[PDB]
Amino acid sequence: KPVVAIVGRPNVGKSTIFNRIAGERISIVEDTPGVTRDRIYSSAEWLNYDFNLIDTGGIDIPFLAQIRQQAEIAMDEADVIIFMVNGREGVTAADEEVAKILYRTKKPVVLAVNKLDNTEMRANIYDFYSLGFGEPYPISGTHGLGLGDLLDAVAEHFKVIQFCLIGRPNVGKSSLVNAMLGEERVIVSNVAGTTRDAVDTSFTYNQQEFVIVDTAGMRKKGKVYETTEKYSVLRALKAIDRSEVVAVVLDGEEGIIEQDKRIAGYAHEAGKAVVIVVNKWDAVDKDESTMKEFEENIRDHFQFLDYAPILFMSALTKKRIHTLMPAIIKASENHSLRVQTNVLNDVIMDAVAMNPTPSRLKIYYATQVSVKPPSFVVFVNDPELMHFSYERFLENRIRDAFGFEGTPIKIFARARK
Amino acid sequence: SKAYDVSEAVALVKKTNDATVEVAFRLGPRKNDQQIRGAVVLPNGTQRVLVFAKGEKAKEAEAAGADFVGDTDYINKIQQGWFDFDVIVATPDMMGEVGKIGRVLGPKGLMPNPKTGTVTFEVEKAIGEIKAGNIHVPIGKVSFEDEKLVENFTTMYDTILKAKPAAAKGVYVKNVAV
RNA sequence: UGAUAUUGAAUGUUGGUACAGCUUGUACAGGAUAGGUAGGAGCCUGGCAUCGGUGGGAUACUACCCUGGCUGUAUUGACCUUCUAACCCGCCGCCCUUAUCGGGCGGGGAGACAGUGUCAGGUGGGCAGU
Numbered sequence A: 001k002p003v004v005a006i007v008g009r010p011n012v013g014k015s016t017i018f019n020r021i022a023g024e025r026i027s028i029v030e031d032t033p034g035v036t037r038d039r040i041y042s043s044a045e046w047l048n049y050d051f052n053l054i055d056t057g058g059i060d061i062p063f064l065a066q067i068r069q070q071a072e073i074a075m076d077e078a079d080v081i082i083f084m085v086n087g088r089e090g091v092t093a094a095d096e097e098v099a100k101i102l103y104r105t106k107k108p109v110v111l112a113v114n115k116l117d118n119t120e121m122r123a124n125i126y127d128f129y130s131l132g133f134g135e136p137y138p139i140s141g142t143h144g145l146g147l148g149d150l151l152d153a154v155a156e157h158f159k160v161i162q163f164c165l166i167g168r169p170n171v172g173k174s175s176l177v178n179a180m181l182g183e184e185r186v187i188v189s190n191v192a193g194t195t196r197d198a199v200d201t202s203f204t205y206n207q208q209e210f211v212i213v214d215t216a217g218m219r220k221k222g223k224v225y226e227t228t229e230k231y232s233v234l235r236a237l238k239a240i241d242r243s244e245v246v247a248v249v250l251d252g253e254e255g256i257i258e259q260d261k262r263i264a265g266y267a268h269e270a271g272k273a274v275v276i277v278v279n280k281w282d283a284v285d286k287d288e289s290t291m292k293e294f295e296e297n298i299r300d301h302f303q304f305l306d307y308a309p310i311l312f313m314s315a316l317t318k319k320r321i322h323t324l325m326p327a328i329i330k331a332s333e334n335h336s337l338r339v340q341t342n343v344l345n346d347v348i349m350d351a352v353a354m355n356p357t358p359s360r361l362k363i364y365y366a367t368q369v370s371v372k373p374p375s376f377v378v379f380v381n382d383p384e385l386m387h388f389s390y391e392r393f394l395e396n397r398i399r400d401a402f403g404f405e406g407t408p409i410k411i412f413a414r415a416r417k
Numbered sequence B: 001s002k003a004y005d006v007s008e009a010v011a012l013v014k015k016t017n018d019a020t021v022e023v024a025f026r027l028g029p030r031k032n033d034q035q036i037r038g039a040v041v042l043p044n045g046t047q048r049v050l051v052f053a054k055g056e057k058a059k060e061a062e063a064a065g066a067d068f069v070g071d072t073d074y075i076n077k078i079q080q081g082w083f084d085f086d087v088i089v090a091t092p093d094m095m096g097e098v099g100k101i102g103r104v105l106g107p108k109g110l111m112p113n114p115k116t117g118t119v120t121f122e123v124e125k126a127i128g129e130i131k132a133g134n135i136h137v138p139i140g141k142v143s144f145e146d147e148k149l150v151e152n153f154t155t156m157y158d159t160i161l162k163a164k165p166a167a168a169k170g171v172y173v174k175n176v177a178v
Numbered sequence C: 001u002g003a004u005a006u007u008g009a010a011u012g013u014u015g016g017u018a019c020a021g022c023u024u025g026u027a028c029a030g031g032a033u034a035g036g037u038a039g040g041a042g043c044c045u046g047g048c049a050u051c052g053g054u055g056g057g058a059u060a061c062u063a064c065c066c067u068g069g070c071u072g073u074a075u076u077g078a079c080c081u082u083c084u085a086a087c088c089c090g091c092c093g094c095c096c097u098u099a100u101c102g103g104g105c106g107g108g109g110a111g112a113c114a115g116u117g118u119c120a121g122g123u124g125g126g127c128a129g130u
């Protein structure tokens, strides 16, 4: 499929153009550093029903070398490299520095000029012929002007389950993902906050395709009073809604932090399969009964989720990394499973017989409604008599009658009707 | 090792020869926003200026001293040929057309652009006055006298400084190479 | 855990910054794969030189700032290893004085550390308001 990439110095509204191409994916803010740290992928079409889009960060002379490397890598796969530049400020030395790479790149290049929001000063498309490229074009993300001609200029050169990953910042999420697909795809830095939004990639494993997304970490709500840079957290929360398997990552060197329990709450309340994951065993000791020290401690603190399997692996030394997916596939089935109506009812009155302590609440019927998560409805004389202690009791019996491992369960109650 | 004076270097670039005395000046991109690139008429001062005048503006262009104006479009004569001569100026109406239709001014340094005072409605006043962050400026000849290049470098430096770029902070002066 | 002040000297290591003086920047082509950025007015002191050249860049020589390095100059920083003079003694002797308070004068021990005043995370139902 065709590949198209956008490059240039920062603050030229590259991500703005990328978004109005389709939807709203990349975060759009106005500041010199607030650029997309790495490359992203998407799909597009204009009368060809087939195109792909790639967005990167700004290029200049903190960390900028990794962004430059990503921009260079994106220049490889792209068929045409839309090269967007400001119009109001004319040209710049950094523009020539950017143009040097394109000069050394033997691929077709289309030049575009942004910040042309009205007709009159649209006539400012001049002096860009010195760059050595073809005819420039006008575009404005605020009003979507000149889009058809630009897309025609691009066209003239025309030739599965999703699982997420969350956690508190600086626990190795980015290192874990790029040490798992085998290819440098996302950035890794010592300072917290390296990632700035969701990164999506697709891949096939054991003749099965998969989708993996990173979420740049999550910190406490109270102390997140940043300069709208926490606007990315909304993007991270969005990925959970589109994901169906959630991987929570905890550091092994550090103990269980209170914020980790809160983060795991969001996944549980979303009715999504969870697999608790811990990283960085290279720091703390690996020995006998050190397995159970954190294995037991997690159970004591993380009571609300017990179905989640516990996996240990360190991304730095790549120990037991290949064991992550075996957990994932098993969790995939249990989140979408139905049990027979006959069998499910037969188990219900066995539980209530040995515990005849429900006037007295009456159980009459039981069945399943949804596949994911497995919702069940029980017809009773009155749902007011239902007690949260007894409601939890029903869940344990169901979770013990069958496997139902690594997935939450919800029980609904209906009146006599 | 020694930085000479202005009154000594004009008499000494007589001796650095009929050659042309030119000035380099290192400016102080970061500052591209307030960059320093430009042209000004000169005091102590052969070109061939060809104009792209449109409408009535050709009628005052043929009497000021220009060599060839045109038949309102000779970019087709520019295509496959066109030994360009000295200087290309234009007017703010056909510039957009000449820019797109003309595809031979980028790496040749004659593309009309109204940032330089060369694309305007005053074509009669424009013919008569033309005849990494660095600026080059020809101020004159070897055969000029000692009092000519002093006013020439004074006018060009006052033009540079008159234009004290925004973000004036930090040193503005780095080097003068006569 | 971090800064900052209380807060010192010596040598050893030791970077950064600034000002200097020398070097590098690999273009099909092109005078050795010996830079962009303003170019075009010289040999014969062993050699051979001098236009110009598919070249976007040759200089029959006039003539600026960069980029990475190498040498000096100053600034400071980071440190180690010491010392001593603040700062600290719920250690000894003497005097206030008859006094397990306190304060002076001597020894000893620690010594730029700890302790103290203003700025980040976690901690932890530590304690409150709901």
Ligand SMILES: Nc1nc2c(ncn2[C@@H]2O[C@H](COP(=O)(O)OP(=O)(O)NP(=O)(O)O)[C@@H](O)[C@H]2O)c(=O)[nH]1
Binding pocket: A008, A009, A010, A011, A012, A013, A014, A015, A016, A017, A027, A028, A029, A030, A031, A034, A035, A036, A056, A057, A058, A114, A115, A116, A117, A139, A140, A141, A142, A143
């Ligand atoms: N007036 C105006 N402003 C625009 C237009 N397009 C973008 N902007 C402004 O430019 C700002 C920066 O754009 P953005 O897409 O965030 O660029 P970026 O995140 O730095 N990505 P990149 O560095 O690759 O260019 C936006 O916040 C917006 O205010 C436009 O057509 N008109």
Ligand SMILES: Nc1nc2c(ncn2[C@@H]2O[C@H](COP(=O)(O)OP(=O)(O)NP(=O)(O)O)[C@@H](O)[C@H]2O)c(=O)[nH]1
Binding pocket: A168, A169, A170, A171, A172, A173, A174, A175, A176, A187, A188, A189, A190, A191, A192, A193, A194, A195, A214, A215, A216, A217, A279, A280, A281, A282, A283, A314, A315, A316, A317
């Ligand atoms: N000891 C150890 N260190 C690790 C491991 N994985 C990463 N690190 C280091 O710890 C830091 C974590 O980097 P990163 O993967 O970006 O963690 P993150 O910030 O939580 N992810 P993101 O960048 O997406 O926000 C980096 O400095 C990395 O070198 C690991 O398995 N063990």
